[PDB]
C-alpha cells in the first residue's frame, strides 16, 4: 500500500478503522458520528506520513498543522490531541532525531530501568524525550543486551540477533534511516548437503520440503478441526502432533499395501477355483472320448440305439469342449489382471531412512525459528504471532547489529557493571539495590518513582532467584513466568583468511546423522564482508553443546566443512567464537516461545504493571510502581528485536501517562 494509507500500514495500524488504543484516548470520537471518525483517521494517517517521510527531525505539532489541509486543519485541538497521542505512544518522534523544541531544564519524576538491552534503551530515550530523569542499570560492560556483535580487526559477526525480518511495517525501517546501517538482502537459496558431503538432489530437496509444509498443515487440522489439544490431562505439543501425523501416514501406507495384495489373493483364489473346474472338466472329456471311441467300434449299419449312443456322446464331448474354452478365455482375463496388479504395487514405505534425515533438517530449522525443541511448543498457539508478519525480504546488518543499541545509547545515563540484586516497590516509591559486578563488595542504592524491568525471561525464571522482588511478585505474575518458555540457540563464528565457499550463497545446510543431532551444526551463513562463516546449533543440541569445549565444537565444524568443500580448501580459522546463552547469567537462554500449556495471553500478563499495597492501612490504592518491557511482554511481536523496541516504546508511554498525566483524553 501507499499514500496516507501506506503510513498506517507501515506503523502496524488499520488505516480505515480505529484501534482499541485510540478508542480509549478518544472515546468521544469512536462513539460519535462516522464522519468525525473519518476526520480523525485522516489526520492520524497524515501525521504518520509526515513523520515517516523524514524521521531524522522532530515532527513538531505546529510543523504538522502547517502541512495539513483544510477542512482538516481547522479543529486545531483535534490535531493537537492526535499529534500528542502519536508522540506519547511512540508512533512518531521515536528513535534518534534532531530535536526542534529543546529538552526541558527541570526534569520531572525519576525512572530506574533495569537492563540496557534494546527494550531498555528504547524506553530510556523516550522517557528522557518526555522530560523525565532516567538511569539505566546494566549488569554487563556493554549496552547491547541480546544484540551482541563480535569485533576483532576487520572481522564483525553477530552472536545475537542478526536478521531484520523485513521492512514492511517494521519500526526498524525507521531506525535504519536514522542510523547508518549496511542492510543487505538475504538470498533464500539454500542447498543442503548430507553427512557424506554431497548435495541433495533437487528431486529430494524439493519433494521433502513439500512434505514438511503438508505435515505442518496436518497438525493444524488436528488442532482446529479435531480439538486434539489435550491428551490424558496434559496439553499436546507440536512435536507429538507431528509424530501422530507421521504414524498415521505410516499406518495408511500399510493399509494401502494390505488391501492391494488382498486383491491378489481374491484373484489367485478365483483362478484356483477356475483351474479346479478346468482340471475336472478335462477328466470328464477324457472319459467321454473313450466311450465315444468305443461306441464307434460298433460298425455300421447299426441299430438306432447304437447310432444314438454314438451321436449322443459326440454332442456331449463337443459341449464340454465348449465349456472348457469359455474357461481358458476366463483364465486369460484372470491371468493378466494378476500381472496387472503386480505391476502397480503401491508405495513401499512412507519415508526412507534418507528422507527422514532430510525432513529432520526441516524440523531442525523450525526448532531454530522458535529456539526450542518441538516437544515443548504448544500445538495450538505456537504460531499465534504469524498474523502480524512483516512484508519484504529478510536482511542482515553487514556492519554488525550492535551499531543500533550503541546508537540509541548516546546521551543516556547508563551504569555499566551494575547488577541489580533486589527491587523494593512500595506505596511511596522504589529503591533498587545493585552491586558492582567487578567487586561484588561495593553496594549501590537507587531511589525512584518507578522501576522499568527489562530483565530477560530467563532471568526472572532463575531458581533460586537472581533478583529478589520485595514484596514478592503476585501469583498471577509468577505463574505466567513458569508457564512461558525460554528457548536456547547458539552460534559458532568461524573467521578465515580466504573465501572458500560459494560467495553468492548466503546460506547452506548440513543434514544430520540422527534425529537427536538434527539441530547440531545444521546451517551456515555468509553475510559479512570479511571471510566469515557462521554456524547454528538449534533444538535439543543447543543445550547439550554448551558442555563441550570450543576446540571440539570447531573440530566438528571443520569436519562438516571438509566433507563439503574437501580437505584441502578449508584452512585453520584465524579467530573462533562460540556462544552459550543458556550459560550467560544475563540471558539464561536466547528468546521466548509459547510453551505447551501457555498461550499468547501469558505475554499480556507479563506486561501488566504492579501497583503495591498501601503503607498506612486505610490509605487509598496507590500508583503502579513496577513496569515491564522487553521481548517477553509484546504478544503480537515476541522473540524479536523489533518487538523488544516496541515494548519499550509502549512502556514509556504508559509510564509517562501515569506520572505526567494524559492531557489528550479530554
Amino acid at each position: 500500500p501507499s499514500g496516507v494509507e501506506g503510513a498506517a500500514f507501515q506503523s502496524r495500524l488499520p488505516h480505515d478503522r480505529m484501534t482499541s488504543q485510540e478508542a480509549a484516548c478518544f472515546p468521544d470520537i469512536i462513539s460519535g458520528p462516522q464522519q468525525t471518525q473519518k476526520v480523525f483517521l485522516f489526520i492520524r494517517n497524515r501525521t504518520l506520513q509526515l513523520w515517516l517521510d523524514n524521521p531524522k527531525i522532530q515532527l513538531t505539532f505546529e510543523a504538522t498543522l502547517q502541512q495539513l489541509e483544510a477542512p482538516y486543519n481547522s479543529d486545531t485541538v483535534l490535531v493537537h490531541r492526535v499529534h500528542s497521542y502519536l508522540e506519547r505512544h511512540g508512533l512518531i518522534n521515536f528513535g534518534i532525531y534532531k530535536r526542534i523544541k529543546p529538552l526541558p531544564t527541570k526534569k520531572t519524576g525519576k525512572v530506574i530501568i533495569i537492563g540496557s538491552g534494546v527494550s531498555g534503551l528504547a524506553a530510556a530515550r523516550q522517557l528522557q524525550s518526555f522530560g523525565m530523569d532516567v538511569t539505566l542499570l546494566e549488569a554487563r560492560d556493554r549496552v547491547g543486551g541480546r544484540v551482541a556483535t563480535f569485533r576483532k580487526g576487520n572481522y564483525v559477526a553477530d552472536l545475537g540477533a542478526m536478521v531484520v525480518t523485513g521492512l514492511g511495517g517494521n519500526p526498524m525501517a525507521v531506525v535504519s534511516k536514522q542510523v547508518n546501517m549496511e542492510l543487505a538482502k538475504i538470498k533464500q537459496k539454500c542447498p543442503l548437503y548430507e553427512a557424506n558431503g554431497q548435495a541433495v538432489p533437487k528431486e529430494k530437496d524439493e519433494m521433502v520440503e513439500q512434505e514438511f509444509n503438508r505435515l505442518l498443515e496436518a497438525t493444524s487440522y488436528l488442532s482446529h478441526q479435531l480439538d486434539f489439544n489435550v491428551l490424558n490431562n496434559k496439553p499436546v505439543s507440536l512435536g507429538q502432533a507431528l509424530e501422530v501425523v507421521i504414524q498415521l501416514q505410516e499406518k495408511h501406507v500399510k493399509d494401502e499395501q494390505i488391501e492391494h495384495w488382498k486383491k491378489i489373493v481374491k484373484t489367485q483364489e478365483e483362478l484356483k477355483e477356475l483351474l479346479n473346474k478346468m482340471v475336472n472338466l478335462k477328466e470328464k472329456i477324457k472319459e467321454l472320448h473313450q466311450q465315444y471311441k468305443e461306441a464307434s467300434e460298433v460298425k455300421p449299419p447299426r441299430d438306432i440305439t447304437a447310432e444314438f449312443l454314438v451321436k449322443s456322446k459326440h454332442r456331449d464331448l463337443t459341449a464340454l469342449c465348449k465349456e472348457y474354452d469359455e474357461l481358458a478365455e476366463t483364465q486369460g482375463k484372470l491371468e493378466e489382471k494378476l500381472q496387472e496388479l503386480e505391476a502397480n504395487p503401491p508405495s513401499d514405505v512412507y519415508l526412507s531412512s534418507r528422507d527422514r534425515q532430510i525432513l529432520d533438517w526441516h524440523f531442525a530449522n523450525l526448532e531454530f525459528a522458535n529456539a526450542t525443541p518441538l516437544s515443548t511448543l504448544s500445538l495450538k498457539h505456537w504460531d499465534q504471532d504469524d498474523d502480524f508478519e512483516f512484508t519484504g525480504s529478510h536482511l542482515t546488518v553487514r556492519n554488525g547489529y550492535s551499531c543500533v543499541p550503541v546508537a540509541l545509547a548516546e546521551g543516556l545515563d547508563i551504569k555499566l557493571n551494575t547488577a541489580v540484586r533486589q527491587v523494593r516497590y512500595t506505596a511511596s516509591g522504589c529503591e533498587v539495590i545493585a552491586v558492582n559486578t567487578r567487586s561484588t563488595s561495593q553496594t549501590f542504592i537507587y531511589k525512584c518513582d518507578a522501576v522499568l524491568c527489562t530483565l530477560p525471561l530467563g532471568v526472572l525464571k532463575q531458581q533460586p532467584p537472581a533478583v529478589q522482588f520485595v514484596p514478592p511478585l503476585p501469583e498471577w505474575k509468577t505463574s505466567a513466568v513458569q508457564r512461558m518458555g525460554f528457548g536456547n540457540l547458539n552460534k559458532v563464528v568461524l573467521c578465515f583468511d580466504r573465501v572458500f565457499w560459494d560467495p553468492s550463497v548466503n546460506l547452506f545446510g548440513h543434514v544430520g546423522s540422527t534425529t537427536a543431532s538434527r539441530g547440531e551444526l545444521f546451517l551456515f551463513w555468509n553475510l559479512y564482508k570479511a571471510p566469515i562463516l557462521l554456524a547454528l546449533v538449534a533444538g535439543e543440541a543447543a543445550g547439550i553443546m554448551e558442555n563441550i569445549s570450543d576446540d571440539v565444537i570447531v573440530g566438528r565444524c571443520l569436519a562438516i566443512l571438509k566433507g563439503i568443500f574437501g580437505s584441502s580448501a578449508v584452512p585453520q580459522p584465524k579467530e573462533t567464537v562460540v556462544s552459550r546463552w543458556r550459560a550467560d547469567p544475563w540471558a539464561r537462554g536466547s528468546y521466548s516461545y509459547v510453551a505447551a500449556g501457555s498461550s499468547g495471553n501469558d505475554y499480556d500478563l507479563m506486561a501488566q504493571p504492579i501497583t503495591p499495597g498501601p503503607s498506612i492501612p486505610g490509605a487509598p490504592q496507590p500508583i503502579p510502581r513496577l513496569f515491564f518491557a522487553g521481548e517477553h511482554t509484546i504478544r503480537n511481536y515476541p522473540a524479536t528485536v523489533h518487538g523488544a523496541l516496541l515494548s519499550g516504546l509502549r512502556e514509556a508511554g504508559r509510564i509517562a501517562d501515569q506520572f505526567l498525566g494524559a492531557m489528550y483524553t479530554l
Binding site: 503438508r214 504414524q247 451321436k311 463337443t318 459341449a319
Partner: protein, 133 residues
C-alpha cells in the same frame, strides 16, 4: 475443514494411536504381521495353482472332434424321427442338445415335432420319466 490431500487423519485412527505410548508401534505391527500372513498365503495358492496348471499340459487338443457341417433339412426320416425319442429320454427339454444330436433339425420344429407326434410317440410318458431322473 479438510486435511491436505494425500494426508489421512480420522478420529478413530487418532484415538487408536493416542491410547498408550506403544499403541502406535502395536497398531503398526498389527498390519506388518497381517501383511505377511496374506503375502505367504499368496505364494501358497501360487504353488498350488502351478500344480493344477501343470496337470493341463496340452489342453484338450487330442480329444477334440470335427464340426458336423450339414445343411438343415425339412422332412423327417424314421431314423431321424427315432433318434429324437431317445434325445427326449436323455435330454428332457433341451431342444438345443436335441437339435445338436440330430444335426439336421430346426431347434424350432423340434418343438413342432414335440407338438406333432406327441401322441403317436407318447412323448408325454417319455418326458415324465426323463423327469424321474
Amino acid at each position: 475443514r479438510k486435511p491436505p490431500k494425500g494426508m489421512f487423519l480420522s478420529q478413530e485412527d487418532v484415538e487408536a494411536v493416542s491410547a498408550n505410548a506403544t499403541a502406535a508401534t502395536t497398531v503398526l505391527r498389527q498390519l506388518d504381521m497381517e501383511l505377511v500372513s496374506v503375502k505367504r498365503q499368496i505364494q501358497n495358492i501360487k504353488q498350488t495353482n502351478s500344480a493344477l496348471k501343470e496337470k493341463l499340459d496340452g489342453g484338450i487338443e487330442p480329444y477334440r472332434l470335427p464340426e458336423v457341417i450339414q445343411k438343415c433339412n425339412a422332412r423327417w426320416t424314421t431314423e431321424e424321427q427315432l433318434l429324437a425319442v431317445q434325445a427326449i429320454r436323455k435330454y428332457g427339454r433341451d431342444f438345443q442338445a436335441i437339435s445338436d444330436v440330430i444335426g439336421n433339425k430346426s431347434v424350432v420344429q423340434v418343438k413342432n415335432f414335440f407338438v406333432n407326434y406327441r401322441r403317436r410317440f407318447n412323448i408325454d410318458e417319455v418326458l415324465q420319466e426323463w423327469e424321474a431322473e
